[PDB]
Subunit: 165 residues, 12 copies
């Protein structure tokens, strides 16, 4: 059960982070504003859908290894380790900055969990690799808005009132 | 027939406004230009499709209460009460400003019609509520491009040659 | 630009005629009455859909050759050259007669445009050929209701109060 | 429970009428004969399908407000208030006349129920408005076969052996 | 092989009749004219499709019992036993009369084949029963246009220039 | 016409029984209650759909052999020969018992009709065999809830308040 | 803005309740156990999907009336007014009891909101009626497992270790 | 009408050739035998479907220019100009050789018709170009089985009993 | 029960044979090798799917007549009466020869069962006819690879190392 | 080839176990009886489909590493290592107990194979991880019926004649 | 063969240009960066798909006129006549400028080919017209981002670090 | 960045190889000739589609780890390490031999990359395992045409002018 504990911990911690991202992507989807609001509205709906699918797969995997899955709102608030997204109307450049950082740090933690459970539970490890893959992709998709090129640093001045993001 | 007249008037006036919006969204869809042209191209196609569906439902409702439906081009021009959209290539910021105002004022007039016919014809009133719902949504979707946030007033300078929209 | 002018003129004039037909087929779709009303209701919806698709392709082609597309209601009314359809409840035999004549004359004008632009702009000419094809088909479909046969002149007396159409 | 009684009564009475219409449209669908038999065959199948969907929604709403739904054949026969459709081969003009009258009178009774329950049960009232909408549409679709126009009274002589319907 | 001969004969004769009907329904589909032309256009396309499916099943069954299938144009012309449909524009009432008679007589012959092969080849007999079912249905659908009712003999005068069909 | 009478009788009697089952499965679908209510809700919807399809095929076959189809509510009540299902909330074990008996007895009567018409009308007989097949399947699906096994008599005590069904 | 405040309050309070239900139905979906676990697993997935669709529509409506939507996890926890669902493996009878009570009380509060906003904002009121409709349906679907019938009180003893629920 | 005659002749002659190919591809589809029988079975079904679609378009075009379409079996036999395919079981190499020649010669004749009608009827000419395109593609697909390569002359010895095709 | 025994025996024996064919077609699907391996791979997948559907229908029919269905692996091995397919890589010509013989002999036995049960159980007999139909079709599809034609005996030398199959 | 042997052994042993499960889930699907029979009928069909997909992927992987796949019925019987499921009508509680144990032990053996081949053949190991994932999920779905909760031990007494499973 | 040479040359040269565009649109799809990166990501995927479809049609046409198609990577590099797209992260404004120029010049060359082959090979000419149509459309879609309007020159300063593109 | 370098190198090298295979499978798809040309045409289209999907996933993964993706034609030619496929008409046996060797050697190199990056980047390693899986499958599908069996060495003499491949 010291092996089982490892898997359960890794899965539970991943479920909570995805659920936090679920709620944040949807909040941003509705509240985003500015030049890129519609672009981000659509992109975040796609992210919401991929995150939602993996939140299901994670919980199902917990049940599959014989553990109860804790997907409750209180647990999402409690088992934070991650900033809440601001309320109110959200600027496009603020959404981009927010998820660039959130996806990067969630991807990092899943990366570590993969190594922690590979030896005891390669099937769980394998699911977590798939989650890490989608989260790093979503990180790229947010990163790309401000990605430096030979011809243009893309500082975001145009989407952030003349100021670099 | 003083009750029937109310319903017919409310439906006819709504049909004409939707038909005007049909033609304007499609014109903007083809002619829009600038940084947001493709974004608006796609968004306006979706608006065109929701407006078209409600233009059908309105006409069908007219026939259902026993009145002929006037959907002719001459009637659209005649029964204006609404600015025509400019010809030529249209700037993205001009499209945004145009529909922000058009959807708001069309939504306002449908809002009034709902109250005018609720008592005599709640079924008609109910259709008009659905039309008001979609038009106010589309108003939001245009509004959002220039919506003020704590971090960025989103003046549209970036989509309007350095000038606030 | 004397070559470009030819193409733009042919496309614009075609767009306006299709848009006029769009509005007329839909008006007839809702208002048609009599023995054939449901038959025509369905047939005209199909015609509306094929005309609508070609109104899109025409406008897109205008943009593709570098010209703005004028699809506004005022332009439809202005750039007539074609009778408006009557308001009110419409008899089945009157719808049949109306579109038999409208499709024939629209097809004739597109036929001429094809020849006018084939040499400068065969790609545009080719689109216009496709439009002419659908309009002549729709002409047949209306014509067929009153088409003379060895066994029956099909005068339309049965759909026109005992009188030949 | 004097409020609950109102809702249950309105829903039950609506369910029975839709079920009666279900059976009558299908009977007519199979047995209709004459020039318009195939037209009516198809139209009545569509009406059957929309009525069937609303018969489901009505029963479900009854269960939702906590009442049993009575959809039995005996109840349909008992809780008449509406003519049965004749057996045997049915003429097209007789089908048209029959449903023109049946849909009009069913629509009228649902109209009244909407007002009776709006104050206590706006959610039920709202469903009944949707049912009234479809029934009035179907009334139009039957009415249209004999609708008077400037050019043709459409007496139905052609579908009724030379006699006005 | 006296048993095999029976099956092959029944299948081949059925294939040829269906192929003849294939070509005739399609010819009528294109050439039909008058008040019912569009109604018949659509109905005959559906008949064409059901006949085509059974022409495939019949040929496949021939191959399945180990015999070559003769579906050639010369065989259709040769192995007539059935009137050709007239060329030229065809009146709606003439199409109705033609298929009423053709489907009835084809159904009759398949009926006989079923009995001829039931004992040796119930699987073939069973396919032929399915073909007989569709052909008798199509016979009804043509018959229904002129079916006598208590209120209207439906003589077809309205679709046949004032003359009973 | 002594042969035709046999077919018409067999088809009509089958149509009425299916229509009775249509109404009863739907009533049970809405009103069923207890541990198995949702299971039965879904199962009975599937049964409703298969019965409905065969009620269509039966009526169509009646028309195909040249007879009017009697699908009216009065005929369903009249041409009983079968218990009505109780009104009110229905227990799961009562639904199971009811359809176990109804499907068995309907299947038995169709079995007899098949033999009665095989010689005159094998195509009709064949349709009735398909109806008998689905009804016997549905009988199994209800039977299975209380089917005796080596390890458990399945008396239904658990779904019937501690009492064997 | 005293009218706008009413609408915003009603919508926001509804959004939060649906989001709470979203998380609870999914938790129950994964963790439910016992005889009815699979039945409830499937049923709760359907409820999750209908609630999710309405959580989207509510937020969109908030944006449409010009207000930011607060869908954050902290707000769900804060703006409780509703019990959290227990963690751990959940018994089928406990899930049934939980949602029977939760849906009933959520439906009650939405019922009140409808009346509060009907006069100022009938379009919002109308959305809330649709939400109330689905929540009352889901209440029925949970209620039905323990619904009293003439033949069986359905106490749930069979799904609750021999004890009435 | 000397221009109309040209178009009608070109269309009619094309329709007949496609109809001949329709029947021949299907005959070959059923009767083909040998190593490549299944390959050819599938390929010829695809060819049958593309030819069938163009046989429809050709006939429709005839009607569209105001002429009756002659698609009768007698006309297919009469207006030959093309070999009939042999009856009986057909060898794969014989099918390949047959259609290689038939498609090549049909494509050649359509090529000529295109030039004959381009000036009077570019819309018809354009349809005929599309038919020529598909027929030349199908010619390639048959040709390819015996196409000479640097490493292998592909004489067909393997599919033709050791003899070059 | 002497009648029931007949049906059960015929169904059970058919189920086992189809299950044997299920496993053999799939084995051949994976292991087939040579010039025709891909052709056979695809063809055998289609055969697997049609056989699988009928293995379901047979078992369901057993349950429908009130008997348990024995579909266990031990029963497939036991209730042989049919050669097992060789293990290892399988040559295309060996697959063709194998199924040509297996389908022919399975079809023969089902043919006999049809006659054995027609009188007691025409509904079962009818299912078995459908199974016999598909098995004889599949027999043709294998036979066709080596079918003798006027121009080529198709000995299979090309797919069998220069030797006739 | 000592590395290849490992992979082939792991794949073959997995294929056989999945094929055994294929046949057992389907047998249970048809024969299951009692309160949960329909629930299990549906659940086992889903399990059958996921197992079938993985039986295909496993065999394909064997071929991909260059080995023949042994999927024959004799091999399933021979290469047991697993209990056969009983014949006859099966009780719901017996099905639940059977697969709870079978899936657990199959999952355990695949778990071991993953470790055995990870180093030589990570691609094969990866497929086997996916198989282990689905089998452990299916284990959960069977386990859940008798899963202990704070409020109810779920002994299965209700589905097992008053006795704990 | 001087006519054949013309067609082959025109087709081959077109194939190579489309293949070059295939690779460039996909490269840009992955590497594009900045405010418009996601907009362009999606747009370029659509362009990739339309170009890919025409690269297939062109090659197929080459085979159809009896010539081998050269679609190899070496030929794409060799038969340049067109700039390669830069490696590395690409700015949105650089992608827009690149394809604006590439599509314009590819469209120009196809325009010329159409004239070169119209007389010998109108079917090929016609395909090339369709390719020219899509390429000119894609040119518009890139052009539109910087299209001058009465209210805004759209210099691209906002997407190009404050500098006009 | 010594870890990042490893991943980028492995991904880039894989992307280039897949892109080379993309172009080669499509070239072979169009140009393949002989007895197996159509079989290979279809098979290679499927291979093209699976390779294309993985070329997308690889590039996306490169972007996801923060590196630019080089998918340019020059890079495909440059970063060869693999033979180009010959131009001109290609014999079936030459296509089979070519891809048998190409897929085997590409699969081998991806196998090595998996090991090189597993420790630093298991998510990348995992994608590469999926690519290796599809490439080894495609290798089998080409291998199978010439796979040795107990009854036939399958030398390919029949597809290679009497000579072993
Ligand atoms: Fe509504
Ligand atoms: Fe059948
Ligand atoms: Fe074209
Ligand atoms: Fe994976
Ligand atoms: Mg901003
Ligand atoms: Mg601008
Ligand atoms: Mg009239
Ligand atoms: Mg009549
Ligand atoms: Mg006539
Ligand atoms: Mg009970
Ligand atoms: Mg319990
Ligand atoms: Mg041969
Ligand atoms: Mg061989
Ligand atoms: Mg039990
Ligand atoms: Mg930039
Ligand atoms: Mg060769």
């Amino acid at each position: 059960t010291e092996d089982l504990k490892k898997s359960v911990q890794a899965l539970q911690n991943t479920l909570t982070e995805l659920q936090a991202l679920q709620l944040q992507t949807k909040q941003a989807h509705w509240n985003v504003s500015g030049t890129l609001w519609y672009t981000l509205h659509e992109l975040l709906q796609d992210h919401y859908e991929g995150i939602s699918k993996f939140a299901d797969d994670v919980a199902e995997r917990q049940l599959s290894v014989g553990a109860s899955s804790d997907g409750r709102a209180i647990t999402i608030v409690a088992a934070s380790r991650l900033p809440e997204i601001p309320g109110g109307f959200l600027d496009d450049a603020q959404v981009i900055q927010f998820f660039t950082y959130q996806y990067e740090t969630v991807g990092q933690r899943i990366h570590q969990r993969v190594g922690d459970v590979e030896k005891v539970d390669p099937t769980t490890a394998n699911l977590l690799q798939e989650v890490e893959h989608i989260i790093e992709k979503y990180q790229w998709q947010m990163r790309a808005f401000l990605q430096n090129t030979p011809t243009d640093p893309n500082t975001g001045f145009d989407i952030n009132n003349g100021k670099p993001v």
